[PDB]
């Protein structure tokens, strides 16, 4: 039982991910970062403006089909 999530980057590009309700979102963050060629934790991934932790899952965050995750650069000093 998968849902599809839509990850939108700083340049408005999109990558979609098919995940289970039990998938640890670390897997999504790592995959996205790998495809951008940057370290995972150099980015911040937000769902409804709130930061996604490594061991969050779609179930824990109440995500549904076609929900959007936004990706921003990490904030700096």
């Amino acid at each position: 039982e998968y849902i599809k999530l839509k990850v939108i980057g700083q340049d408005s590009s999109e990558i979609h991910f098919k995940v289970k309700m039990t998938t640890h979102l670390k897997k999504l963050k790592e995959s996205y970062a790998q495809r951008q060629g940057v370290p995972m934790n150099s980015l911040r991934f937000l769902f409804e403006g709130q930061r996604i932790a490594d061991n969050h899952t779609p179930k824990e965050l109440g995500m549904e089909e076609e929900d959007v995750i936004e990706v921003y650069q990490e904030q700096t000093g």
């Binding site: 590009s13 990558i15 995940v19 289970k20």
Partner: peptide, 8 residues
């Protein structure tokens, strides 16, 4: 850009 779906 083409559609990109990654299955985890």
């Amino acid at each position: 850009a083409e559609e990109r779906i990654i299955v985890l």
